[PDB]
Design a protein around this ligand. Structure first.
Ligand code: VII
Ligand code: ZN
Ligand code: ZN
Length: 266
């Protein structure tokens, strides 16, 4: 007699869990996550913003990196998200408890976050994390301003219903740098065609390729840094091979077209 299987925790490559010191992207913007998961701190004269936190277990590390940058728990005003999967929104509930941060997100991301990632359209209850509530709901193209860094939301549904690119203008050497944090355009293990839980999935992805291609994009960053060819562990060379938003979108569309063909064959 065979019992039901134990629960299996989702495990990741060691580099996804490997702490790194803050890496400066532009005058106000730093990577403060691990070697292989993005978590961006944007520091202003009127508080700080975090875009993504990575996995559930990264909360204390993020807080240590914030302190190294001079940002206290009270100083963190706002959390934004690329999308609400465990590997990017992991530690959000814990950060809200340990800091002043409030969460702004679109309705789709807020609903999935409130679920802690459960009942995912594709992963089901396979990748759950602690639930969190959003404090503010944002619409496509809506702007949020903190200390004169202006973040604009660009909905790019597909990877999740609520996938979002966040764009802002920072500086380097007194010159503007248009940063684009574009969400994932992967479909890992997804049923793409005739999916009853996401009937217009393909059309949403195609529109999202177009959105990403057109973003204001001097520097592209992605939730998984490898997708945009970042190597955070390479210090001074971390961003040298980085893709343009146009190149990222083209590569993603080519991979998606291959996946569609394999699906039809399978
Ligand atoms: O966010 C996702 O859906 C992806 C995840 C993931 C999601 C939740 C928990 C653990 C991993 O891994 C990957 C991934 C796995 C291996 C290599 C690169 C990315 C994802 C992707 O392709 O977007
Ligand atoms: Zn994801
Ligand atoms: Zn991911």
């Amino acid at each position: 007699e065979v019992p039901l299987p134990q629960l299996r925790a989702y495990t990741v490559d060691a580099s996804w869990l490997q702490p790194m010191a803050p890496l400066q992207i532009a005058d106000h913007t730093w990577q403060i996550g691990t070697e292989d998961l993005t978590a961006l701190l944007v520091q202003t004269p009127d508080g700080a913003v975090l875009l993504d936190g990575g996995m559930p277990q990264m909360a204390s590390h993020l807080l240590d990196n914030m302190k190294a940058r001079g940002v206290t728990p009270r100083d963190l005003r706002l959390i934004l998200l690329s999308h609400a999967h465990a590997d990017h929104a992991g530690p959000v509930a814990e950060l809200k408890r340990r800091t002043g941060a409030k969460v702004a997100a679109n309705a789709e991301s807020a609903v999935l976050l409130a679920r802690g990632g459960s009942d995912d359209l594709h992963f089901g209850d396979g990748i759950t994390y602690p639930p969190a509530n959003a404090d503010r709901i944002v619409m496509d193209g809506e702007v949020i301003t903190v200390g004169g860094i202006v973040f604009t939301a660009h909905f790019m549904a597909g990877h999740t219903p609520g996938s979002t690119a966040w764009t802002w203008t920072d500086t380097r050497n007194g010159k503007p740098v248009r940063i684009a944090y574009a969400d994932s355009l992967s479909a890992p293990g997804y049923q793409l065609q005739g999916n009853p839980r996401y009937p217009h999935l393909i059309e949403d992805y195609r529109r999202s390729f177009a959105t990403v291609r057109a973003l204001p994009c001097d520097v592209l960053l992605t939730p998984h840094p490898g997708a945009s060819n970042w190597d955070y562990a390479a210090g001074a060379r971390a961003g040298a091979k980085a893709l343009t938003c146009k190149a990222y979108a083209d590569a993603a569309e080519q991979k998606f077209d291959g996946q569609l063909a394999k699906e039809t064959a399978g």
